[PDB]
């Protein structure tokens, strides 16, 4: 009906599509605000006639290759997950295995065995013990000396007939009757996202396929293994590509310089998506690269067996399921009725010149009077290699409905462009990519006289949050800001955060203990400069950008007599904005709105959370 | 009985002594390892007859001024104030109150003064508009404000309430309340400046503005202040003053710090940190020593009688009475200790730079022809003090065949104010040498100590000094650093006392000032060749997890041998104050790591096989 | 994967096959060690699309004759009868049922016949006016009578009920019910004589008076009877008969016992005990075989199809279909038994006294030039049979390096009737010789078997043989005796089946008969030279606890080395039917006891240390 902090609860969220023969499966997720829980329903849709059947309180659908049956997960309260198998015809099901700590399940070609990947920890009640690095990872909790577990599960007898473990952050996939195992390669310390060793495992014995390469195995058609990466990388920020390995490594993407978002191989054909200029598009490789779905949108996921299906999300609509027969046909409209009565604001794309480059930019125009001006919010995506674009961004439609101009850009370092365009940001953070945004703003103001230049706020999460702190220390233009799970100091990010030990050396430069860049590019040392009211938002479970990042910056700013507030969420990780409990997320949305309302649209003194939140 | 990780559970811990007339009240606390809980039993003794009655599962005893009745607390999740007639010990639930930090009797034996706090208390998120965002052992402030309740114990109602800013305190003075509040300039000045008000019937009058002391007690005629009238540094020795309407310092001739003190009918009882001891004195208009020697007086109370809790290096506290002489009231742990070997430390003086410093060591039972390894303890601080109190680890490791050694480097409490102030901005320089010197001198008096094996451990500042040691020195063969500091800058912007404490102890303009990076172990991490164990807890806001974890992460990035154990619960003091099962595990770990990385080295550390 | 105490939990156990039209249904059972529970899942297979569908946490599948619906039970302490539509498997709850032992469809695919029991159910005490006071696996009778309910599954009501004496049974015959009730003279004669009635609408006529068979099945024109018309000994082979109102025995020229039988459309499907095998046959008016080989057919059903469970010495049952050839329907354990080694027993013939006997032995993997210890297993009985079924302990111990050796002594099932009758009042005489002689022939065949370590073990009658062996012989270096017999007199008076069984197998006039003392191991106890482990369970009324405990106490009084393990739960059959955790402990115990007293003898058995 109207846009507010709850409206997101009214959307149907689709995820994790799967297909075999003429069947499609996916997960329907709702945010239940009353019970404060997410509900999951696997939907199984027959092609031809649109008929649906359901598996309630379940997720991770996997359809057996023979299309006779489907495997899934139910989660528990008692804190344990169960693996179930149901027959596809009647949907009667049985409980196969009770498994905690299971991150994935994949069918074998025989529609009998499953491959489960998971982890084991030390699990002492009173304390965690760590001999390795890092001590934690975001959304995974404290590693507590975690290792990777592999289970070959028989769904008939319901037993684990094979099990072995590997180092932390390994992964595996079926290759025929054998398993392809990717283990992060270790020199001084495991080199994550950089180098892997790859093995071929069958019946307790393995052989090494690759030594210290830059790619890992994401899929197999049983003849060929699909490799995701480059064979070798100078920078993890380099565009990931895809390779087919028959015993020779043949890259099919060499001519195309873009990063591969997602890929799957079936029957020698390879379906994959790319980041391009704010979009994520779907292509097929039959031995030539062919276009499938390309436009202003993001393809969130896809699967192909006899048929090709994918989820398509847009700037104004959450994902719906589509089928491609050689023409695109839309299979589901879940949110059709809600958005019939709900106004959406489409972003207008513009080009602008910044230094030596021409960049992409977008703004949303609220409804205002021909005789009046509107306040502006500048969003800055996480990164640096994140990308803004044609996906669905809640806050943006929210604030547009409330009368704000919405403006965002893809500064150098962003994904969706040339590899070089991305690498440029390296040890450049806060210099050129910040000018990119200021120039994007300026071109925007010129395109839109009705935007009031005197009220312009800025907000961002993660890297965006760092950019928000930076913007307030380095510029006079912003009347308000909201910084979330950001970075005020690069050094602690290097030592503290989950990925800090590798990522920072690359993005901020080497020799962190010495290198003066770390204090030079960090907003924390520029604190005396901030003249704007600022809200900091953080979450206690976020190991990507740890609590200190927000809290130090807040404490110091307060010591300098600045106006700043900190909201610390008791639960939730780095992604808590989208992934936290519905009630949590709602309160954040309410806070986000109200701050921009009282600090930007019209400035008023102080912030009273008790009175404001009701 | 033998010494191990479980041995601390067998001790009776006494606390919070109280007296009115001839009656004595105190708390008996046992650590139950099975139920993994602490058990509290209020014991009430008749000064004669030795007779003991009890109040089960309760604490915070307060005896009425008329000694007819006693107030106490029972904690569940809510706390309840109870009142029992002392004669039959029959009791009634008076007020059910969560977040009450204290209770005190009005002179009339009717009204109570209860000092709590109120917070925003949203379930999903905390919101902070003030500083700091948290305090160690108090949790996240979440906009905390101080509350004051005047409770009538008869009708059982709250007849008065008002609130003050965070960290405010109050006490009874006659029929009014003395309210001390932290003074605000930009941010509240904690431990530095206070405004003091006198409060009655809704109206207040400001007694003091921007003073370095606050009101710690009253006899109702006079007000006892704790602090100085003005301080250039918080690290200055805190003294006592009698305010009758004119401030009079009674301590002006003694340069020492007061630990504790109270006023009863014109007379002032107090304790001082002196050279590794805490001694009890009485001021009747002259300073007269009551209990002095090698020990700590951990608490005391006096009305018609003077009682106190004495604790020594070989023993946990017991209750003592003094008439003209000392008489030991209770032996709780005697039977147990009869069966347990105890080690008295040996006092020794040493030369460090220009000063003569105190030192101590404990000598194990050693084979006539053999040498023993050494464990160096560094106390919290900088203004903490080692001495004659009871340190579990020391006894434990002693009975385990280790040399125990510790010193009081400059900056330590218990000496001249200047002796303490010397450390300011000097952290890791002079005091470290003081430790290096004390060590040498020790090795000299004890040739039996094996210089080839010397370890070091410490908590908080002691943890920092441990880190510092392994970066600055090839002397130590291993270390255990608990809740310490690898980096001073974050200690400034992150922890609870950082904003002020760091500026004074480290330097001003922290963002610029290079001292923060120079005295910070994290930058010297390349220099560490000794195996290190890093210990932390998730609830400690004094020295946040970043201090231990960043250090551990960096060291691992450099290929050093290091380990980290992070306790899912507990604050800065979790080692002593953690849950029994928690504390035992830490003891067993502490124990095993010194065994395996120091006494006889070995490769790797397996916490699974080693714990059980 | 490796063989150990826990390996049995990795196998899928199928039971209770049923079929109608093109449909098949059976029960999948798994032993869950973590939850310590047995899990059942009804599996329904279509012979059309070769597909599976499931009914979770359920058993007793019964498919309606028209193939449209399936009835089943869910237990938990109640039980409930459900009905599901076979196409979608949507299910509705029909009747909440306590004490229902069986359910069967009427030809109308509407009504069920439930047979069950009712007792006195006093909370504090059981009261018994009949015999016996208890039955193994049924608990104490407490006055129990058999109850019969006719249930309409549409309206979900009991339309008909009546009751008969204890141990009565019934089956549908057309629209009527054939009731078999035990014939009473002084006490009911169980397993000897029955009276048979035809019951409809509250009315009954008597078909048979005091006959030695009862009614097993009906095709609605014909009643299948199981027994003989007249048996002198209950140990006589039970045969099958067809009653159209004249009685025709179909097996007359075959002297073998029928294990199971069913009748559909004038044809009779049945199994036979033959020489270690249980084989499937059909009778179309001439006996013709279906599945014959080294195997046991554990169950079967026929309507439009013939399906059966087949189990072998190396594999648990899998399901098969017979179209005129055998086709394997299920391999549940196939993947497991790729990675798990199994041992096919070698069959051998030997001579004993006047007979030629069957024997089997498993040869372990041995270091050549060295020898392996032996374990003789004795089957229950005496009319039990060893053979081609799957015996866990045998696979377990063979994998641990033991020879396994067992025989069917005279009195065993699966040979001529006279062969079975030979053992009567002979227990411990000839059949024990049969075992000794078999062992001797085996030692010849396997010179690598070490005759200086040979153990012996058995359950029930086999525990009897184990006791007997240690008192009657010097051959054995150790033994494990489970739920056996030391003293026959108490077997007769105390045990569930004693009053009839012991008169037939041991002898008549039990109180006056010297055989009861003479064949009892207990009276020879002074003879035992070999360490012995006794195993019992408190719930076994087949061989009551005194059997093990008296033998134990006596042996101790004589200074012998003996131990006793008493399982707090479980009946006679607890080794297989006990709770998974229970069964695991039993296995671990069995294994470790043979290891430490047989393979290499050591002093003492410390159970707290030996099992985890
Ligand atoms: Cl299956
Ligand atoms: Mg809802
Ligand atoms: Mg199951
Ligand atoms: Mg990448
Ligand atoms: Mg009351
Ligand atoms: Mg002080
Ligand atoms: Mg019903
Ligand atoms: Mg029979």
PDB file of N, CA and C in Angstrom, chain C residues 342-379:
ATOM      1  N   UNK C 342      33.364 -59.860   4.076  1.00  0.00           N
ATOM      2  CA  UNK C 342      32.501 -60.898   4.628  1.00  0.00           C
ATOM      3  C   UNK C 342      33.089 -62.279   4.370  1.00  0.00           C
ATOM      4  N   UNK C 343      32.723 -63.240   5.212  1.00  0.00           N
ATOM      5  CA  UNK C 343      33.340 -64.562   5.186  1.00  0.00           C
ATOM      6  C   UNK C 343      32.318 -65.649   4.896  1.00  0.00           C
ATOM      7  N   UNK C 344      32.417 -66.300   3.742  1.00  0.00           N
ATOM      8  CA  UNK C 344      31.514 -67.411   3.449  1.00  0.00           C
ATOM      9  C   UNK C 344      31.957 -68.647   4.212  1.00  0.00           C
ATOM     10  N   UNK C 345      31.070 -69.194   5.054  1.00  0.00           N
ATOM     11  CA  UNK C 345      31.380 -70.421   5.798  1.00  0.00           C
ATOM     12  C   UNK C 345      31.587 -71.622   4.873  1.00  0.00           C
ATOM     13  N   UNK C 346      32.481 -72.537   5.243  1.00  0.00           N
ATOM     14  CA  UNK C 346      32.654 -73.780   4.498  1.00  0.00           C
ATOM     15  C   UNK C 346      31.806 -74.865   5.142  1.00  0.00           C
ATOM     16  N   UNK C 347      31.057 -75.573   4.309  1.00  0.00           N
ATOM     17  CA  UNK C 347      30.185 -76.625   4.789  1.00  0.00           C
ATOM     18  C   UNK C 347      30.928 -77.945   4.847  1.00  0.00           C
ATOM     19  N   UNK C 348      30.712 -78.728   5.900  1.00  0.00           N
ATOM     20  CA  UNK C 348      31.293 -80.069   5.949  1.00  0.00           C
ATOM     21  C   UNK C 348      30.385 -81.090   6.620  1.00  0.00           C
ATOM     22  N   UNK C 349      30.491 -82.334   6.174  1.00  0.00           N
ATOM     23  CA  UNK C 349      29.755 -83.440   6.769  1.00  0.00           C
ATOM     24  C   UNK C 349      30.669 -84.176   7.751  1.00  0.00           C
ATOM     25  N   UNK C 350      30.128 -84.640   8.879  1.00  0.00           N
ATOM     26  CA  UNK C 350      30.916 -85.459   9.813  1.00  0.00           C
ATOM     27  C   UNK C 350      30.102 -86.615  10.397  1.00  0.00           C
ATOM     28  N   UNK C 351      30.785 -87.582  11.011  1.00  0.00           N
ATOM     29  CA  UNK C 351      30.107 -88.733  11.605  1.00  0.00           C
ATOM     30  C   UNK C 351      30.046 -88.599  13.121  1.00  0.00           C
ATOM     31  N   UNK C 352      28.875 -88.834  13.700  1.00  0.00           N
ATOM     32  CA  UNK C 352      28.764 -88.807  15.152  1.00  0.00           C
ATOM     33  C   UNK C 352      27.972 -89.999  15.661  1.00  0.00           C
ATOM     34  N   UNK C 353      28.617 -90.901  16.387  1.00  0.00           N
ATOM     35  CA  UNK C 353      27.876 -92.062  16.866  1.00  0.00           C
ATOM     36  C   UNK C 353      27.216 -92.789  15.676  1.00  0.00           C
ATOM     37  N   UNK C 354      25.888 -92.773  15.610  1.00  0.00           N
ATOM     38  CA  UNK C 354      25.159 -93.396  14.501  1.00  0.00           C
ATOM     39  C   UNK C 354      24.741 -92.475  13.342  1.00  0.00           C
ATOM     40  N   UNK C 355      25.109 -91.202  13.400  1.00  0.00           N
ATOM     41  CA  UNK C 355      24.593 -90.251  12.422  1.00  0.00           C
ATOM     42  C   UNK C 355      25.660 -89.533  11.618  1.00  0.00           C
ATOM     43  N   UNK C 356      25.247 -89.018  10.465  1.00  0.00           N
ATOM     44  CA  UNK C 356      26.081 -88.124   9.685  1.00  0.00           C
ATOM     45  C   UNK C 356      25.460 -86.754   9.798  1.00  0.00           C
ATOM     46  N   UNK C 357      26.276 -85.777  10.168  1.00  0.00           N
ATOM     47  CA  UNK C 357      25.792 -84.459  10.543  1.00  0.00           C
ATOM     48  C   UNK C 357      26.365 -83.336   9.668  1.00  0.00           C
ATOM     49  N   UNK C 358      25.643 -82.220   9.620  1.00  0.00           N
ATOM     50  CA  UNK C 358      26.105 -80.996   8.984  1.00  0.00           C
ATOM     51  C   UNK C 358      26.941 -80.122   9.896  1.00  0.00           C
ATOM     52  N   UNK C 359      27.927 -79.453   9.315  1.00  0.00           N
ATOM     53  CA  UNK C 359      28.771 -78.530  10.053  1.00  0.00           C
ATOM     54  C   UNK C 359      29.242 -77.375   9.184  1.00  0.00           C
ATOM     55  N   UNK C 360      29.658 -76.294   9.825  1.00  0.00           N
ATOM     56  CA  UNK C 360      30.153 -75.131   9.102  1.00  0.00           C
ATOM     57  C   UNK C 360      31.322 -74.525   9.848  1.00  0.00           C
ATOM     58  N   UNK C 361      32.240 -73.917   9.108  1.00  0.00           N
ATOM     59  CA  UNK C 361      33.321 -73.175   9.745  1.00  0.00           C
ATOM     60  C   UNK C 361      33.790 -71.992   8.921  1.00  0.00           C
ATOM     61  N   UNK C 362      34.140 -70.923   9.624  1.00  0.00           N
ATOM     62  CA  UNK C 362      34.681 -69.747   8.981  1.00  0.00           C
ATOM     63  C   UNK C 362      36.167 -69.654   9.279  1.00  0.00           C
ATOM     64  N   UNK C 363      36.970 -69.491   8.238  1.00  0.00           N
ATOM     65  CA  UNK C 363      38.416 -69.372   8.413  1.00  0.00           C
ATOM     66  C   UNK C 363      38.860 -67.915   8.355  1.00  0.00           C
ATOM     67  N   UNK C 364      39.521 -67.436   9.418  1.00  0.00           N
ATOM     68  CA  UNK C 364      39.940 -66.029   9.449  1.00  0.00           C
ATOM     69  C   UNK C 364      41.157 -65.807   8.552  1.00  0.00           C
ATOM     70  N   UNK C 365      41.656 -64.578   8.463  1.00  0.00           N
ATOM     71  CA  UNK C 365      42.900 -64.330   7.734  1.00  0.00           C
ATOM     72  C   UNK C 365      44.056 -64.466   8.716  1.00  0.00           C
ATOM     73  N   UNK C 366      44.922 -65.446   8.479  1.00  0.00           N
ATOM     74  CA  UNK C 366      45.944 -65.815   9.451  1.00  0.00           C
ATOM     75  C   UNK C 366      47.337 -65.645   8.885  1.00  0.00           C
ATOM     76  N   UNK C 367      48.302 -65.379   9.764  1.00  0.00           N
ATOM     77  CA  UNK C 367      49.693 -65.337   9.340  1.00  0.00           C
ATOM     78  C   UNK C 367      50.180 -66.779   9.217  1.00  0.00           C
ATOM     79  N   UNK C 368      50.584 -67.164   8.008  1.00  0.00           N
ATOM     80  CA  UNK C 368      50.916 -68.558   7.728  1.00  0.00           C
ATOM     81  C   UNK C 368      52.188 -68.982   8.448  1.00  0.00           C
ATOM     82  N   UNK C 369      52.125 -70.149   9.078  1.00  0.00           N
ATOM     83  CA  UNK C 369      53.177 -70.587   9.975  1.00  0.00           C
ATOM     84  C   UNK C 369      52.736 -70.307  11.398  1.00  0.00           C
ATOM     85  N   UNK C 370      51.566 -69.688  11.516  1.00  0.00           N
ATOM     86  CA  UNK C 370      50.957 -69.418  12.810  1.00  0.00           C
ATOM     87  C   UNK C 370      49.528 -69.939  12.810  1.00  0.00           C
ATOM     88  N   UNK C 371      48.949 -70.022  14.003  1.00  0.00           N
ATOM     89  CA  UNK C 371      47.630 -70.609  14.187  1.00  0.00           C
ATOM     90  C   UNK C 371      46.645 -69.615  14.805  1.00  0.00           C
ATOM     91  N   UNK C 372      45.353 -69.897  14.662  1.00  0.00           N
ATOM     92  CA  UNK C 372      44.318 -69.009  15.182  1.00  0.00           C
ATOM     93  C   UNK C 372      43.410 -69.728  16.179  1.00  0.00           C
ATOM     94  N   UNK C 373      42.919 -68.997  17.200  1.00  0.00           N
ATOM     95  CA  UNK C 373      41.990 -69.546  18.195  1.00  0.00           C
ATOM     96  C   UNK C 373      40.630 -69.832  17.578  1.00  0.00           C
ATOM     97  N   UNK C 374      39.814 -70.621  18.275  1.00  0.00           N
ATOM     98  CA  UNK C 374      38.519 -71.045  17.762  1.00  0.00           C
ATOM     99  C   UNK C 374      37.371 -70.699  18.703  1.00  0.00           C
ATOM    100  N   UNK C 375      36.207 -70.452  18.120  1.00  0.00           N
ATOM    101  CA  UNK C 375      35.010 -70.232  18.898  1.00  0.00           C
ATOM    102  C   UNK C 375      33.894 -71.125  18.391  1.00  0.00           C
ATOM    103  N   UNK C 376      33.456 -72.053  19.230  1.00  0.00           N
ATOM    104  CA  UNK C 376      32.322 -72.889  18.885  1.00  0.00           C
ATOM    105  C   UNK C 376      31.019 -72.186  19.286  1.00  0.00           C
ATOM    106  N   UNK C 377      30.101 -72.057  18.335  1.00  0.00           N
ATOM    107  CA  UNK C 377      28.792 -71.475  18.606  1.00  0.00           C
ATOM    108  C   UNK C 377      27.779 -72.604  18.680  1.00  0.00           C
ATOM    109  N   UNK C 378      26.880 -72.540  19.653  1.00  0.00           N
ATOM    110  CA  UNK C 378      25.811 -73.525  19.756  1.00  0.00           C
ATOM    111  C   UNK C 378      24.450 -72.852  19.625  1.00  0.00           C
ATOM    112  N   UNK C 379      23.659 -73.276  18.650  1.00  0.00           N
ATOM    113  CA  UNK C 379      22.380 -72.622  18.435  1.00  0.00           C
ATOM    114  C   UNK C 379      21.360 -72.978  19.495  1.00  0.00           C
TER     115      UNK C 379
END
